[PDB]
Amino acid sequence: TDRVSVGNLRIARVLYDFVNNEALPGTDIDPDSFWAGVDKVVADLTPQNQALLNARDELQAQIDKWHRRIEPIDMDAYRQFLTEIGYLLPEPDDFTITTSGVDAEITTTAGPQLVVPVLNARFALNAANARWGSLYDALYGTDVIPETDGAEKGPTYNKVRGDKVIAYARKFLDDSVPLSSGSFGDATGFTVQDGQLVVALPDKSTGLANPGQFAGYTGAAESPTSVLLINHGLHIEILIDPESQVGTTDRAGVKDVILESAITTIMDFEDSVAAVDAADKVLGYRNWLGLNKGDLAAAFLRVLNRDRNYTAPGGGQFTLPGRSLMFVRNVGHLMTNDAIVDTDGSEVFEGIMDALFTGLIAIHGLKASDINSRTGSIYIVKPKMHGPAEVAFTCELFSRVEDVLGLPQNTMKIGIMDEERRTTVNLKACIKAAADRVVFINTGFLDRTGDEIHTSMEAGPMVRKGTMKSQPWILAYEDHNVDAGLAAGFSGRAQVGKGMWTMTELMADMVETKIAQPRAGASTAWVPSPTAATLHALHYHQVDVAAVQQGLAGKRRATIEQLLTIPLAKELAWAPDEIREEVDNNCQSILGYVVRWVDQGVGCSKVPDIHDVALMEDRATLRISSQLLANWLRHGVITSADVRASLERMAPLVDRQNVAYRPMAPNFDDSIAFLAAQELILSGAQQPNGYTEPILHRRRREFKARAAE
Ligand SMILES: O=C(O)/C(O)=C/C(=O)c1ccc(O)cc1Cl
Ligand SMILES: [Mg+2]
Ligand SMILES: [Mg+2]
């Protein structure tokens, strides 16, 4: 109740102080009219925000009762019913996107896209610096080069493993920017003569099979420090330094091979951070503002990067950006947050808050620092939207914030998350709702799965979690997303993107698997680390995404029948041990992620599963695990005693795995973290659309209360 009255709102003090003292100075916006704008937008838009939420339960309540009636499929009765209640809306006539004022990294460049918790300062700093990463470092410290005999990693440098790193990179160069004759492995040096690349072999001195891939160099042209290359819009740089220990042994004195990695980075306020009050929102706002003001620094002291100067092939000076073009992921429409209350006591919607405050903050990126978008746009991802009407509401919100922040209309562009069922089967209408704003569509397959499990909770027992990846509804969902994206002129205008790789240390598996996404037409895909972005950049150098896309133009490869194929299981597909392992695995990952969410405030964690695989957990993966067990419990393939035994089995395992920690076992009934995970399961099928923030925020709001009395 240390709150600031502005009209009908009682803004928490620490937030109000942060906006006036750190966010507003430099933007030339009168704080009085800003806060009056906050009060006006909240009062004018909260009614429909709440109205669109009641419409979700109302629709889901009918789909619950309909499933309670006994043929298997019948996509005929299921369809005209879903159109009757307004789930299935008409398909609008074809159209093209009008969104303008967008940067090259969105419209044209195809490459990895990094997502990072905005509450972790060092993470967001390295995520912003991730536009340029070392390939040597990515290959050495990772199992992409396996530790067979000789290539074992250790405290000192291993020349054997280091030699395999160099040999790996040499075929990358030969496979991405080849020579006319010979191979990069036998190159004895590099020079620039008469404005073109000349590489000396032991036989001769070949050039580039296409000289148009010679992007530039540093140092002198007759002995460069570095050679700049370009392939499929992505830049490659060879560092030349015979003085360095790696270059000392390299056949051409090469120290490293630099890759353009995360061309864009998403700053996340949502499923990968735990922010439940005004105090938590401010640290994310402060970090997000430091990234826009350029002065974000971590205690050496780590800072952002200036752009990279170069020499053209002719001799002129040019420059290339050293930072990733930053998005920001607001929170969805669901949750409220006591960062602001009204005179009546109720909490204001958290999504309205983020658009006003992250939007005010993003203005600092538009001007000079001691800089983000140069074409004048603000890039905001809005997740967890349900259908085209919610996209239009999301659009009127941004149109009201621009008016309040003064910016010209359509300044705040939006990347649509394609991760709920009602959006998936109404996607063409959702893109049109943001026809002049949309920046990307992206298949959030994890959240889309949890929504598929919940929307058909009453239908029957569902397939095991590891089986959703091969179910027909999700393979259509991906093609259907690429299709209607391209059919709207996204090619050349906006990104068509795909989802997340969670196995943080299975990068050899990532290299031999996430090539499928650029082959599927996606111009971008999600990586969890600056290192994974570097290793993901290899797939775009082997896949001409602009070629894959124009081959897919005019194709329609997914029917409405295919997208509605519910992933139910056939009777008694499972032995007892197969049932138990699924239960243990789901109970394990929930407990591992929740305990750090509730006890320590971390919204993203590495939790090993039952098979000892390190998994990057967020609220989306948590939505899948809880909803699956809550679905198996609802139709009776497990009992309520099986969950508690499994929860009490997996709890001391997590404790031993976990530092300033705190065990849940043995007196489970006392631990707030243990009780939270129990609630997400046993009350799982009654959380709206399976969302986990109601339980998580409340239990986090409860743990903080104890740790102060
Ligand atoms: O499939 C989705 O719904 C989607 O949006 C993915 C994520 O949000 C995510 C998952 C795991 C992580 O470690 C990080 C993130 Cl960012
Ligand atoms: Mg090529
Ligand atoms: Mg998601």
XYZ file of C-alpha atoms and ligand atoms in Angstrom:
727
model
C 0.000 0.000 0.000
C 3.026 2.196 -0.638
C 1.090 3.283 -3.700
C 0.694 6.369 -5.884
C -2.813 7.536 -6.786
C -3.241 8.505 -10.447
C -6.935 8.833 -11.228
C -8.466 5.417 -10.613
C -5.112 3.618 -10.266
C -2.962 3.015 -7.176
C 0.442 2.443 -8.770
C 2.967 0.639 -6.579
C 5.627 3.097 -5.458
C 8.731 1.374 -6.842
C 7.202 1.135 -10.327
C 5.939 4.735 -10.354
C 9.371 5.913 -9.195
C 11.134 3.891 -11.899
C 8.984 5.294 -14.714
C 9.470 8.906 -13.614
C 13.166 8.670 -12.766
C 14.636 6.235 -15.293
C 12.163 5.499 -18.097
C 10.686 8.937 -18.865
C 13.791 11.209 -18.894
C 15.112 11.310 -22.450
C 11.797 10.633 -24.209
C 10.352 14.190 -24.196
C 7.015 12.918 -22.839
C 5.324 14.847 -20.041
C 4.972 12.418 -17.091
C 1.601 13.924 -16.146
C 0.019 13.155 -19.522
C 1.781 9.772 -19.555
C 0.204 8.594 -16.297
C -3.117 10.134 -17.313
C -2.668 8.069 -20.467
C -2.100 4.920 -18.406
C -5.320 5.542 -16.473
C -7.268 6.192 -19.680
C -6.069 3.155 -21.650
C -6.633 0.810 -18.697
C -10.186 2.040 -18.107
C -11.081 1.976 -21.813
C -9.620 -1.439 -22.719
C -9.994 -3.607 -19.597
C -13.690 -4.381 -20.410
C -12.929 -6.259 -23.639
C -9.714 -7.813 -22.301
C -11.904 -9.346 -19.598
C -14.689 -10.037 -22.106
C -12.338 -11.944 -24.419
C -11.288 -14.060 -21.421
C -14.845 -15.080 -20.513
C -15.296 -16.047 -24.170
C -12.463 -18.568 -23.783
C -14.099 -20.476 -20.922
C -17.506 -20.177 -22.600
C -16.156 -21.816 -25.761
C -14.169 -24.421 -23.819
C -17.212 -25.229 -21.667
C -19.214 -26.188 -24.765
C -16.356 -28.268 -26.174
C -16.240 -30.023 -22.798
C -19.922 -31.006 -22.906
C -19.811 -31.958 -26.597
C -17.043 -34.498 -25.971
C -19.217 -36.020 -23.216
C -21.309 -37.607 -25.985
C -19.849 -42.366 -29.040
C -18.316 -42.834 -32.488
C -14.538 -42.346 -32.794
C -13.800 -39.522 -35.249
C -16.761 -37.926 -37.061
C -14.962 -34.835 -38.314
C -18.264 -33.909 -39.984
C -20.262 -33.423 -36.780
C -17.183 -31.995 -35.044
C -16.652 -29.326 -37.717
C -20.094 -27.759 -38.207
C -20.375 -27.770 -34.410
C -17.088 -25.877 -34.057
C -18.289 -23.387 -36.662
C -21.675 -23.056 -34.920
C -20.160 -21.870 -31.623
C -17.704 -19.531 -33.354
C -14.539 -21.606 -32.933
C -14.191 -22.215 -36.683
C -14.507 -18.857 -38.462
C -14.654 -18.226 -42.229
C -11.475 -18.110 -44.288
C -11.019 -14.521 -45.537
C -10.160 -13.941 -49.173
C -6.463 -13.814 -50.069
C -4.357 -10.738 -49.267
C -0.804 -9.427 -48.896
C 0.859 -7.826 -45.863
C 1.307 -4.038 -45.898
C 3.699 -3.817 -42.920
C 6.524 -1.368 -43.678
C 9.366 0.405 -41.879
C 10.942 -2.920 -40.891
C 14.630 -3.782 -40.682
C 16.584 -6.080 -42.988
C 17.079 -8.713 -40.275
C 13.302 -9.294 -40.279
C 12.303 -8.986 -43.937
C 15.236 -10.472 -45.694
C 17.845 -12.154 -43.499
C 17.203 -15.807 -42.671
C 19.048 -16.993 -39.582
C 18.821 -18.106 -35.957
C 16.769 -16.152 -33.428
C 17.763 -16.113 -29.753
C 15.312 -15.929 -26.836
C 16.515 -14.991 -23.365
C 15.102 -14.161 -19.894
C 15.037 -10.379 -19.544
C 15.450 -10.700 -15.760
C 18.948 -12.221 -16.125
C 21.270 -9.321 -16.937
C 24.330 -11.325 -18.009
C 22.148 -13.536 -20.220
C 20.477 -10.637 -22.040
C 23.906 -9.027 -22.435
C 25.422 -12.115 -24.066
C 22.219 -12.609 -26.066
C 22.581 -9.096 -27.488
C 26.262 -9.737 -28.274
C 25.383 -13.085 -29.888
C 25.147 -11.616 -33.413
C 28.811 -12.628 -33.821
C 30.108 -15.830 -32.268
C 33.097 -18.117 -32.569
C 32.664 -21.361 -34.486
C 35.882 -22.769 -33.002
C 34.518 -22.168 -29.500
C 31.148 -23.691 -30.398
C 32.788 -26.832 -31.796
C 35.385 -27.302 -29.044
C 33.309 -26.880 -25.880
C 30.417 -28.931 -27.281
C 29.850 -32.614 -28.099
C 29.570 -31.799 -31.831
C 33.183 -32.983 -31.874
C 32.826 -36.211 -29.849
C 35.364 -37.095 -27.175
C 36.593 -40.345 -28.720
C 40.115 -41.541 -27.881
C 42.432 -38.574 -28.336
C 39.737 -35.924 -28.716
C 38.996 -35.893 -24.991
C 38.387 -32.510 -23.410
C 40.314 -31.468 -20.327
C 41.795 -28.623 -18.286
C 44.415 -27.820 -20.943
C 44.169 -27.377 -24.697
C 43.858 -30.677 -26.577
C 45.536 -30.357 -29.974
C 43.819 -33.547 -31.171
C 40.357 -32.151 -30.430
C 41.509 -28.737 -31.642
C 42.705 -30.286 -34.901
C 39.266 -31.833 -35.421
C 37.759 -28.392 -34.782
C 39.883 -26.888 -37.562
C 39.152 -29.781 -39.933
C 35.425 -29.433 -39.218
C 35.530 -25.718 -40.049
C 37.511 -26.279 -43.255
C 34.749 -28.393 -44.776
C 32.204 -25.774 -43.687
C 34.085 -23.205 -45.774
C 34.379 -25.648 -48.679
C 30.648 -26.423 -48.397
C 29.468 -22.799 -48.102
C 31.845 -20.579 -50.115
C 33.912 -22.908 -52.310
C 37.100 -22.293 -54.237
C 37.336 -22.624 -58.008
C 39.893 -25.423 -57.600
C 41.327 -27.034 -54.493
C 40.101 -27.053 -50.915
C 40.241 -24.658 -47.972
C 42.034 -27.285 -45.880
C 45.229 -26.917 -47.924
C 45.161 -23.112 -48.169
C 48.522 -21.546 -47.288
C 47.268 -17.975 -46.904
C 45.025 -15.182 -48.178
C 45.595 -11.925 -50.060
C 43.507 -9.291 -51.835
C 44.798 -8.451 -55.317
C 43.041 -6.047 -57.703
C 39.955 -6.057 -55.503
C 39.261 -9.789 -55.240
C 40.083 -12.714 -52.978
C 43.140 -14.835 -53.855
C 43.822 -17.965 -51.741
C 47.211 -19.673 -52.098
C 47.211 -23.457 -52.430
C 50.357 -25.604 -52.570
C 49.768 -26.047 -56.311
C 48.603 -22.602 -57.357
C 46.375 -19.733 -56.187
C 42.671 -20.265 -56.796
C 39.969 -17.676 -56.298
C 36.354 -17.902 -55.231
C 34.025 -20.033 -57.336
C 31.862 -16.914 -57.076
C 33.869 -13.732 -56.365
C 30.581 -12.121 -55.282
C 30.981 -13.859 -51.906
C 34.068 -11.756 -51.062
C 32.521 -9.340 -48.560
C 35.648 -7.608 -47.262
C 38.795 -7.781 -45.173
C 40.682 -6.089 -42.349
C 44.306 -5.127 -42.070
C 46.363 -4.659 -45.206
C 45.119 -6.162 -48.462
C 48.464 -7.920 -49.046
C 48.422 -9.593 -45.584
C 44.971 -9.232 -43.995
C 44.056 -9.695 -40.354
C 40.741 -11.175 -41.504
C 38.730 -12.081 -44.602
C 35.004 -11.303 -44.680
C 32.702 -13.657 -46.590
C 28.958 -13.802 -47.244
C 26.768 -16.805 -48.061
C 22.960 -16.904 -48.245
C 22.838 -13.478 -46.611
C 24.863 -14.622 -43.585
C 28.396 -13.354 -43.017
C 31.517 -15.460 -42.449
C 34.846 -14.108 -41.198
C 38.199 -15.907 -41.055
C 40.586 -14.500 -38.446
C 44.230 -14.577 -39.551
C 46.843 -14.487 -36.776
C 49.918 -16.732 -36.956
C 50.922 -15.292 -33.567
C 48.093 -17.039 -31.700
C 48.367 -20.577 -30.348
C 45.706 -21.955 -32.697
C 47.111 -19.965 -35.613
C 50.604 -21.078 -34.740
C 49.783 -24.619 -35.918
C 47.153 -23.849 -38.572
C 48.292 -24.449 -42.152
C 47.337 -20.841 -43.015
C 47.816 -19.172 -39.624
C 44.066 -19.013 -38.997
C 43.035 -18.278 -35.411
C 39.252 -18.745 -35.690
C 36.215 -18.664 -37.983
C 33.552 -16.143 -36.945
C 29.883 -16.719 -37.787
C 26.944 -14.339 -37.925
C 24.710 -16.145 -35.441
C 21.650 -14.696 -33.708
C 20.615 -12.098 -36.283
C 17.743 -11.256 -33.913
C 17.253 -11.773 -30.177
C 13.971 -11.885 -28.242
C 13.997 -10.323 -24.769
C 11.493 -12.383 -22.785
C 9.129 -11.059 -20.114
C 6.966 -14.191 -20.278
C 7.328 -17.955 -19.888
C 11.071 -17.905 -19.077
C 10.998 -15.353 -16.223
C 9.236 -15.344 -12.850
C 7.815 -11.866 -12.181
C 4.820 -11.733 -9.841
C 4.829 -8.246 -8.254
C 5.925 -4.688 -8.992
C 9.400 -5.298 -7.551
C 9.991 -8.127 -10.032
C 8.671 -6.231 -13.066
C 11.047 -3.328 -12.392
C 14.274 -5.342 -12.639
C 13.138 -6.648 -16.019
C 12.056 -3.157 -17.062
C 15.388 -1.736 -15.871
C 17.384 -4.336 -17.809
C 15.188 -3.805 -20.876
C 15.780 -0.054 -20.569
C 19.532 -0.481 -20.164
C 19.625 -2.544 -23.354
C 17.854 0.269 -25.218
C 19.986 3.002 -23.625
C 23.097 0.946 -24.440
C 24.572 1.366 -20.941
C 23.649 -2.076 -19.591
C 26.784 -3.515 -17.997
C 27.472 -6.568 -15.837
C 29.904 -6.441 -12.908
C 35.863 -7.394 -15.901
C 32.679 -5.482 -16.707
C 30.764 -6.817 -19.704
C 29.123 -4.378 -22.116
C 27.339 -4.280 -25.464
C 29.208 -4.236 -28.770
C 29.895 -1.428 -31.175
C 29.488 -2.293 -34.838
C 32.294 -3.923 -36.820
C 34.340 -1.816 -39.237
C 35.671 -3.325 -42.456
C 37.277 -2.567 -45.805
C 35.322 -3.204 -48.997
C 36.864 -5.254 -51.825
C 37.529 -1.960 -53.605
C 39.133 -0.186 -50.653
C 36.345 1.813 -49.059
C 35.255 1.637 -45.432
C 31.886 0.164 -44.451
C 30.368 -1.183 -41.252
C 28.115 -3.999 -40.053
C 25.989 -4.155 -36.885
C 27.510 -5.831 -33.881
C 24.327 -6.345 -31.932
C 21.231 -8.441 -32.495
C 18.011 -6.680 -33.475
C 16.025 -6.937 -30.255
C 12.399 -7.959 -29.883
C 10.583 -8.086 -26.568
C 7.958 -10.668 -25.592
C 5.157 -9.126 -23.569
C 2.931 -11.365 -21.493
C -0.380 -12.559 -22.881
C -3.880 -11.350 -22.104
C -4.509 -13.700 -19.175
C -2.827 -12.577 -15.978
C -3.319 -9.476 -13.868
C -0.624 -8.002 -11.649
C -0.831 -5.897 -8.488
C 1.863 -3.569 -9.868
C -1.207 -1.349 -10.294
C -4.530 -1.677 -8.482
C -7.620 0.501 -8.681
C -9.660 2.159 -5.944
C -11.874 -0.916 -5.941
C -8.870 -3.136 -5.130
C -8.622 -5.118 -8.372
C -5.336 -5.756 -10.164
C -4.710 -4.345 -13.640
C -4.066 -6.633 -16.606
C -0.371 -7.434 -16.975
C -0.474 -7.366 -20.781
C -1.739 -3.784 -20.913
C 1.031 -2.870 -18.459
C 3.787 -4.359 -20.615
C 2.749 -2.665 -23.868
C 2.750 0.736 -22.144
C 5.971 0.284 -20.175
C 8.068 -1.811 -22.563
C 6.768 0.444 -25.334
C 7.817 3.584 -23.469
C 11.187 1.953 -22.792
C 11.751 0.868 -26.406
C 11.781 4.548 -27.441
C 15.360 4.810 -26.146
C 16.484 2.294 -28.765
C 15.199 4.630 -31.483
C 17.789 7.322 -30.693
C 21.466 7.830 -29.892
C 23.319 6.144 -27.034
C 26.797 6.708 -25.624
C 20.863 2.002 -30.828
C 18.417 -0.670 -32.008
C 16.014 -0.299 -34.933
C 17.269 2.150 -37.555
C 14.073 2.163 -39.648
C 11.988 3.309 -36.677
C 9.961 0.286 -35.536
C 9.395 -1.339 -32.148
C 9.304 -5.139 -32.303
C 7.067 -6.849 -29.728
C 6.101 -10.524 -29.593
C 2.606 -11.097 -28.215
C 2.141 -14.717 -27.090
C -0.831 -16.890 -26.136
C -3.491 -15.265 -28.314
C -6.683 -17.169 -29.170
C -8.113 -16.320 -32.571
C -8.444 -13.301 -34.852
C -10.550 -11.137 -32.521
C -7.834 -11.286 -29.854
C -5.269 -10.191 -32.451
C -7.438 -7.179 -33.298
C -7.739 -6.285 -29.608
C -3.965 -6.623 -29.282
C -3.812 -4.204 -32.224
C -6.106 -1.547 -30.730
C -3.969 -1.726 -27.583
C -0.786 -0.793 -29.460
C -2.704 1.905 -31.348
C -3.726 3.423 -28.004
C -0.203 3.277 -26.548
C 1.368 4.973 -29.581
C -1.113 7.821 -29.136
C -0.140 8.058 -25.460
C 3.608 7.787 -26.144
C 3.214 10.140 -29.132
C 4.746 7.776 -31.682
C 3.318 7.605 -35.220
C 0.798 4.823 -35.709
C 1.971 1.275 -36.496
C 5.316 2.011 -34.825
C 4.864 -0.953 -32.461
C 4.966 -3.964 -34.768
C 3.981 -7.433 -33.528
C 5.327 -10.947 -33.979
C 2.347 -13.295 -33.776
C 2.896 -16.436 -31.728
C 1.140 -19.402 -33.361
C 0.794 -21.529 -30.245
C -2.920 -22.002 -29.460
C -5.501 -24.120 -31.252
C -8.055 -21.387 -31.983
C -5.304 -19.302 -33.589
C -3.955 -22.282 -35.551
C -7.211 -23.060 -37.387
C -7.955 -19.346 -37.859
C -4.432 -18.253 -38.782
C -5.234 -16.448 -42.043
C -7.737 -14.296 -40.151
C -5.174 -13.657 -37.400
C -2.486 -12.432 -39.807
C -5.016 -10.129 -41.482
C -5.995 -8.653 -38.107
C -2.388 -7.398 -37.920
C -1.973 -7.005 -41.678
C -0.140 -3.679 -41.325
C 1.716 -4.587 -38.096
C 2.732 -8.263 -38.252
C 6.479 -9.010 -38.217
C 6.425 -12.772 -37.903
C 4.361 -15.825 -37.161
C 6.058 -18.559 -35.165
C 4.999 -22.085 -34.226
C 5.295 -22.372 -30.465
C 4.892 -26.138 -30.565
C 5.103 -26.642 -26.789
C 2.308 -24.232 -25.833
C 0.349 -25.455 -28.865
C 0.613 -28.985 -27.454
C -0.615 -28.026 -23.988
C -3.550 -26.265 -25.626
C -4.289 -29.344 -27.735
C -4.259 -31.502 -24.591
C -6.573 -29.109 -22.741
C -9.033 -28.326 -25.551
C -9.769 -32.067 -25.816
C -9.383 -32.882 -22.111
C -12.843 -34.488 -22.026
C -12.420 -36.466 -25.265
C -10.322 -39.318 -23.889
C -6.903 -40.590 -22.821
C -4.100 -38.859 -24.710
C -0.861 -40.128 -26.213
C 2.387 -40.068 -24.247
C 4.312 -36.801 -24.205
C 7.122 -38.082 -26.426
C 4.572 -39.134 -29.064
C 3.049 -35.699 -29.766
C 6.042 -34.913 -31.999
C 4.850 -37.444 -34.610
C 1.090 -36.895 -34.299
C -0.711 -35.813 -37.496
C -2.178 -32.628 -36.000
C 1.236 -31.139 -35.215
C 2.775 -31.925 -38.611
C -0.149 -30.192 -40.316
C 0.110 -27.313 -37.864
C 3.670 -26.626 -39.012
C 3.005 -26.789 -42.761
C -0.283 -24.900 -42.340
C 1.704 -22.157 -40.591
C 4.377 -21.886 -43.297
C 1.700 -21.946 -46.022
C -0.688 -19.174 -44.948
C 2.386 -17.151 -44.021
C 3.767 -17.325 -47.560
C 0.297 -16.859 -49.088
C 0.285 -13.400 -47.447
C 3.553 -12.182 -48.963
C 5.672 -12.927 -45.888
C 8.452 -13.943 -48.287
C 10.728 -10.915 -48.331
C 8.473 -8.984 -45.930
C 8.363 -10.897 -42.626
C 9.776 -13.955 -40.884
C 8.203 -17.393 -40.958
C 9.669 -19.004 -37.865
C 9.755 -22.299 -36.006
C 10.317 -23.390 -32.457
C 12.650 -24.231 -29.616
C 15.462 -26.736 -29.072
C 15.518 -27.650 -25.386
C 18.332 -30.232 -25.079
C 20.987 -27.739 -24.009
C 23.974 -30.095 -24.455
C 22.846 -32.334 -27.349
C 24.197 -30.015 -30.020
C 25.446 -32.828 -32.247
C 21.784 -33.850 -32.297
C 20.859 -30.214 -32.956
C 23.218 -30.047 -35.938
C 21.775 -33.264 -37.422
C 18.133 -32.299 -36.835
C 17.314 -28.557 -36.758
C 18.296 -28.346 -40.434
C 14.730 -29.553 -41.060
C 13.296 -26.141 -40.152
C 15.024 -24.149 -42.949
C 14.131 -27.075 -45.217
C 10.500 -26.548 -44.149
C 10.626 -22.944 -45.398
C 11.190 -21.213 -42.057
C 13.319 -18.072 -42.260
C 14.107 -18.240 -38.529
C 14.088 -20.628 -35.583
C 14.558 -20.463 -31.830
C 17.861 -21.208 -30.062
C 18.441 -20.991 -26.270
C 22.100 -19.877 -26.111
C 24.553 -17.683 -28.023
C 26.460 -20.926 -28.628
C 23.447 -22.776 -30.053
C 22.781 -19.832 -32.377
C 26.292 -20.197 -33.806
C 25.777 -23.916 -34.424
C 22.311 -23.224 -35.856
C 23.765 -20.764 -38.382
C 25.308 -23.727 -40.215
C 21.886 -24.928 -41.401
C 21.127 -21.622 -43.135
C 24.440 -21.839 -45.014
C 23.330 -25.223 -46.428
C 19.663 -24.327 -47.077
C 18.570 -21.624 -49.530
C 15.487 -20.626 -47.548
C 14.456 -18.034 -50.136
C 14.568 -20.894 -52.651
C 12.643 -23.310 -50.412
C 10.000 -20.633 -49.831
C 9.372 -19.788 -53.486
C 9.133 -23.511 -54.190
C 6.337 -23.649 -51.602
C 4.425 -20.697 -53.082
C 0.804 -21.514 -53.868
C 0.878 -24.924 -52.177
C -1.713 -25.855 -49.555
C -0.579 -28.965 -47.694
C -2.866 -29.156 -44.634
C -6.636 -29.593 -44.487
C -9.002 -28.438 -41.753
C -9.649 -32.125 -41.058
C -5.953 -32.768 -40.426
C -5.489 -29.875 -37.992
C -8.429 -31.075 -35.867
C -7.093 -34.647 -35.520
C -7.118 -35.104 -31.738
C -4.086 -37.147 -30.532
C -6.007 -39.709 -28.505
C -4.527 -43.100 -27.668
C -5.972 -46.452 -28.654
C -7.070 -48.691 -25.802
C -4.365 -50.383 -23.702
C -1.451 -49.169 -25.795
C 0.666 -49.165 -22.626
C 2.199 -51.748 -20.328
C 2.438 -50.960 -16.597
C 6.113 -49.965 -16.808
C 5.403 -47.656 -19.756
C 2.657 -45.962 -17.728
C 4.959 -45.603 -14.719
C 7.892 -44.141 -16.667
C 5.692 -41.457 -18.239
C 4.299 -40.578 -14.802
C 7.751 -40.446 -13.202
C 9.153 -38.375 -16.076
C 6.334 -35.818 -16.016
C 6.309 -35.592 -12.212
C 10.103 -35.210 -12.299
C 10.317 -32.263 -14.697
C 7.432 -30.413 -13.023
C 8.975 -30.656 -9.549
C 12.400 -29.716 -10.896
C 11.123 -26.574 -12.618
C 8.516 -25.472 -10.063
C 10.848 -25.577 -7.047
C 13.134 -23.011 -8.685
C 10.125 -20.980 -9.841
C 8.578 -20.833 -6.357
C 11.540 -21.015 -3.969
C 14.038 -18.898 -5.932
C 12.116 -17.011 -8.642
C 13.749 -18.559 -11.726
C 11.352 -19.005 -14.641
C 13.657 -21.180 -16.764
C 15.762 -24.112 -15.578
C 17.768 -27.097 -16.803
C 16.030 -30.158 -15.347
C 17.270 -33.645 -16.314
C 14.438 -35.949 -17.314
C 14.172 -39.659 -16.477
C 16.703 -40.517 -19.213
C 19.326 -38.055 -17.867
C 18.824 -35.498 -20.664
C 19.239 -31.845 -19.690
C 16.047 -30.020 -20.687
C 15.490 -26.258 -20.779
C 12.183 -25.908 -18.930
C 9.785 -22.975 -19.134
C 6.090 -22.519 -18.392
C 5.230 -23.958 -21.824
C 6.938 -27.302 -21.193
C 5.340 -27.205 -17.740
C 1.929 -26.729 -19.365
C 2.509 -29.936 -21.341
C 3.605 -32.092 -18.402
C 0.897 -30.991 -15.959
C -1.898 -31.139 -18.544
C -0.834 -34.618 -19.686
C -0.876 -36.101 -16.176
C -4.110 -34.244 -15.412
C -5.489 -35.846 -18.586
C -4.317 -39.353 -17.684
C -5.810 -38.910 -14.204
C -9.122 -37.610 -15.574
C -9.837 -40.692 -17.707
C -8.272 -43.120 -15.260
C -5.057 -44.669 -16.562
C -3.514 -43.677 -13.203
C -4.869 -43.060 -9.707
C -4.585 -40.159 -7.292
C -2.324 -42.372 -5.167
C -0.044 -42.982 -8.160
C 0.637 -39.249 -8.533
C 1.538 -38.645 -4.884
C 3.754 -41.738 -4.763
C 5.407 -40.565 -7.986
C 5.652 -36.999 -6.674
C 7.125 -38.245 -3.387
C 9.466 -40.580 -5.273
C 10.810 -37.849 -7.560
C 11.123 -35.154 -4.875
C 14.270 -36.356 -3.003
C 15.841 -37.072 -6.398
C 15.419 -33.403 -7.327
C 16.736 -32.409 -3.891
C 19.994 -34.325 -4.373
C 20.312 -32.867 -7.878
C 20.064 -29.398 -6.343
C 23.680 -24.091 -3.690
C 21.502 -21.719 -1.648
C 18.698 -24.287 -1.934
C 16.126 -25.828 0.399
C 14.723 -29.386 0.341
C 11.061 -30.253 -0.121
C 11.371 -33.759 1.311
C 10.487 -35.202 3.723
C 7.583 -33.085 5.093
C 6.024 -32.352 1.659
C 2.889 -30.885 3.260
C 5.009 -27.944 4.486
C 6.916 -27.107 1.293
C 5.259 -24.450 -0.856
C 7.149 -25.696 -3.924
C 5.878 -29.264 -3.506
C 2.289 -28.115 -2.966
C 2.465 -25.963 -6.109
C 3.405 -28.852 -8.409
C 0.639 -30.951 -6.844
C -1.880 -28.225 -7.695
C -0.820 -27.878 -11.345
C -1.692 -31.575 -11.776
C -4.720 -32.254 -9.597
C -6.359 -28.902 -10.411
C -4.833 -28.889 -13.889
C -7.923 -29.509 -16.020
C -9.620 -26.515 -14.347
C -6.966 -23.907 -15.079
C -8.197 -21.775 -18.014
C -6.822 -23.328 -21.213
C -4.359 -25.213 -18.995
C -2.395 -22.069 -18.139
C 0.030 -22.421 -15.227
C 0.522 -18.764 -14.255
C -2.510 -18.689 -11.867
C -0.953 -21.389 -9.674
C 2.645 -20.254 -10.168
C 2.190 -16.538 -9.468
C -0.035 -17.237 -6.456
C 2.364 -19.784 -4.953
C 5.232 -17.378 -5.652
C 3.146 -14.625 -4.051
C 2.826 -17.005 -1.075
C 6.487 -18.014 -0.712
C 7.601 -14.371 -0.642
C 5.168 -13.731 2.220
C 6.779 -16.360 4.458
C 10.365 -15.289 3.709
C 9.861 -11.943 5.469
C 7.960 -12.733 8.670
O 6.769 -23.628 -27.844
C 6.420 -22.594 -27.237
O 5.310 -22.309 -26.769
C 7.555 -21.572 -27.074
O 7.191 -20.273 -27.080
C 8.735 -21.922 -26.519
C 9.205 -21.205 -25.352
O 8.650 -20.247 -24.881
C 10.434 -21.683 -24.652
C 10.550 -23.013 -24.264
C 11.679 -23.472 -23.608
C 12.720 -22.584 -23.334
O 13.838 -23.009 -22.692
C 12.628 -21.247 -23.711
C 11.487 -20.821 -24.365
Cl 11.395 -19.168 -24.820
Mg 24.540 -21.468 -52.038
Mg 5.169 -20.219 -26.011
